[PDB]
Design a protein around this ligand. Structure first.
Ligand code: GSH
Ligand code: GSH
Lengths: 215, 215
C-alpha cells in the first residue's frame, strides 16, 4: 500500500527531491499532493509550509530534515545514514548547513528577482554574496573528497544536492561551474545516482545564468 | 578527561544551552571557549559561526543540531532521543522548526533594535509578527501536552527551550506570558529541569518587555 502522503509543489522542489528519492529506494509508496494549503495540508502544517507529510498511520510531520530522516530510517539496513555516530552527526551537519546557510539565503537572493518579495539590488547583492561564501565552504571541503560524509553515498548527498539544485536552475552557469568545479562535479554526480535520478526530471545545466540584476 | 571543546559566546546562548546540558548529564567534560574567530575556531567553522565543536578526538562539528545530537548519542542508554522512530523524527522536527522558524526570525526582529543590522520599524514589525505566528503553532500544540515529544523530557525540550529563551530575555513580558500560557508554562518547566538548570544562570522572567520600537 501507500506508506503516506507528501504535500509539496509541482516538480523538483529543493526540499523534496531527497524525500521522494529515499522513499522509492526503501520501497515506500507515496501519494504526492501538489496543491498547497488544503485542509488536510494545514492539518499538518498550520502555516501551510512545504514539505509536509502524513503517514497512512496518519503520523504527522513537517520540516524537510525530519521527513527525510523518518523515511530513511524505515530501512533498518540502510546504508545512507553513515557507519557510526560521527558520520551520522556529519550528515545532520551538512543537511542543516545546506537548509539554513544556503537555501534560505539563496531564496533571499532569488525572490526579489522574480517579483515575489520587494526588490532592491543592493540587498539582492548582499544575499548573493552570503550564499556564495557558504557554498565556498563546500567547494573547499570537497577538494579531494567524493562524498560529503564517508566513502559512500549518504542522505546528506541526496538532501543537499536537492537543496543546491535551486542554484543550478537559476544562477550557476558554465562560468560559475568553472570557478566552482568541486561543487559542480559532486552535484553532477549525485544527480546521476539512480536513486536520485529516478525521481527527478532530466538532468540539465545552464550555459548562461537565467538571472543577474536587474528585473 | 575533557571530551572536547565548544566554541560559543559568553553566557546562556540560544543555540548552546542544550549542548552544555546534555554533555554534563552524559558525563562528558567540555572545555568552553568564549572567544570567537580564533584560528582553532575557524579551523572548524570557516565562517566563524557559533557553536562549533572539536572533540579530543579532534572530530570537528558545526551546526548546533548536529553538535547536540552527537553529544546526546554518546549515551547509548539515553532517554532523550525518543522511544521509537516516530518520536525521534518529532524531535528532529521541533529542533529544526525552533532553529529556523523562530530563532532566525526573532533575530531579524532583535538585531535592528540593538543597532547591529540597519533599522526599520516596518521591517522589524514584519519579523515580530512572523516570529509570533510560529510561536503560535507551539502555543496551540502544547494545549494539553506537557512535553514536545512523548511522555518524558527529550532533546527537543532542552534544545528548543534554549532557543526560545532569546524571546524571554527581550520581548516576553508578563503580558505576553498571559496570551501565551502554554508556551510560558512549558518553557518555565524545562528551565527548572535539573539537567538544564545546572548549566544556566538563575531563572528569571521579565515584567515589562526590554524592547518595543523604536531604538
Ligand atoms: N523550516 C522548513 C522550511 C519550509 C519552507 O519554508 N517552505 C517554503 C517553500 S520552499 C514554504 O512552504 N513557504 C510557504 C510559506 O512560508 O507560507 C523546513 O526545513 O522544512
Ligand atoms: N546554522 C547554524 C547557525 C549558526 C549561527 O548563525 N550563529 C550565529 C550566532 S547565534 C553566529 O555565529 N554568527 C556569526 C556570523 O554569522 O558570522 C546553526 O544552526 O548552528
Amino acid at each position: 500500500m501507500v506508506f503516506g502522503t507528501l504535500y509539496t509543489f509541482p516538480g523538483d522542489q529543493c526540499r523534496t527531491i531527497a524525500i521522494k528519492a529515499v522513499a522509492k529506494a526503501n520501497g515506500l509508496d507515496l501519494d504526492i499532493r501538489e496543491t498547497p494549503r488544503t485542509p488536510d495540508h494545514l492539518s499538518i502544517s498550520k502555516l501551510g509550509k512545504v514539505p509536509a507529510f502524513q503517514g497512512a498511520d496518519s503520523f504527522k510531520l513537517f520540516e524537510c530534515m525530519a521527513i527525510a530522516l523518518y523515511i530513511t530510517s524505515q530501512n533498518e539496513q540502510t546504508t545512507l545514514l553513515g557507519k557510526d555516530k560521527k558520520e551520522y552527526a556529519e550528515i545532520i551537519k551538512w543537511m542543516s548547513f545546506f537548509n539554513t546557510e544556503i537555501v534560505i539565503l539563496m531564496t533571499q537572493q532569488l525572490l526579489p528577482q522574480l517579483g515575489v518579495i520587494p526588490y532592491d539590488r543592493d540587498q539582492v547583492e548582499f544575499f548573493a554574496n552570503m550564499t556564495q561564501r557558504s557554498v565556498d565552504v563546500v567547494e573547499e571541503y570537497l577538494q579531494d573528497r567524493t562524498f560529503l560524509v564517508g566513502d559512500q553515498l549518504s542522505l546528506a548527498d541526496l538532501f543537499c544536492a536537492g537543496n543546491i539544485s535551486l542554484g543550478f536552475q537559476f544562477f550557476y552557469g558554465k562560468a560559475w561551474r568553472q570557478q566552482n568545479p568541486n561543487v559542480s562535479r559532486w552535484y553532477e554526480m549525485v544527480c546521476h545516482q539512480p536513486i536520485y535520478a529516478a525521481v527527478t526530471d532530466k538532468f540539465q545545466l545552464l550555459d548562461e545564468p537565467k538571472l543577474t540584476n536587474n528585473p
